């Protein structure tokens with residue numbers, strides 16, 4: 001709880017540096033023992049191809065799971081998001 | 092095991108929605124009396140994210156409408172060629188307490 005703000009910021013920070021990510025729409029996370037379980041919605045170009053979005057989800061999984069190692073489970077789903085949209089994550 | 096009848100009922104409903112080229116994966120599980128499920132459907136590879144999402148919404152509508160003991164359904168789309176068969180892969184693995192609390 002106290003420490004859940006920091007891991008949320010580390011995950012958003014890592015996710016948004018991935019090419020093809022237009023921001024993190026939603027992220028919920030929970031500790032289980034020492035490891036983090038989280039599910040995240042990333043925003044993506046609405047006109048990307050389904051295959052292109054699956055690559056971006058896949059790359060987001062590698063970069064967040066790779067930089068933060070207290071994560072045991074991360075579920076990433078992709079959603080269309082317009083280029084002008086600047087809504088910050090909600091958590 | 093015990094999930095077989097509803098798992099096939101769900102695949103049946105999904106595959107009748109236009110634009111679904113078969114159901115790739117389906118996991119369904121009870122949480123109390125309510126069913127929680129997630130599935131991956133195969134869609135035309137040049138579907139845009141926007142076009143595929145409409146198929147997902149239409150798949151959520153047909154399944155959540157036909158079965159109604161479904162409390163949660165997650166649908167994701169993945170590229171699948173028109174000639175591809177490969178019958179759906181099923182899982183019936185239960186939800187941890189923490190997973191339910193995640194949502």
Ligand SMILES: [Cu+2]
Pocket residue numbers: 054
């Ligand atoms: Cu893949």
Ligand SMILES: [Cu+2]
Pocket residue numbers: 075076077165167
């Ligand atoms: Cu998913």
Ligand SMILES: [Cu+2]
Pocket residue numbers: 144148
């Ligand atoms: Cu939707």
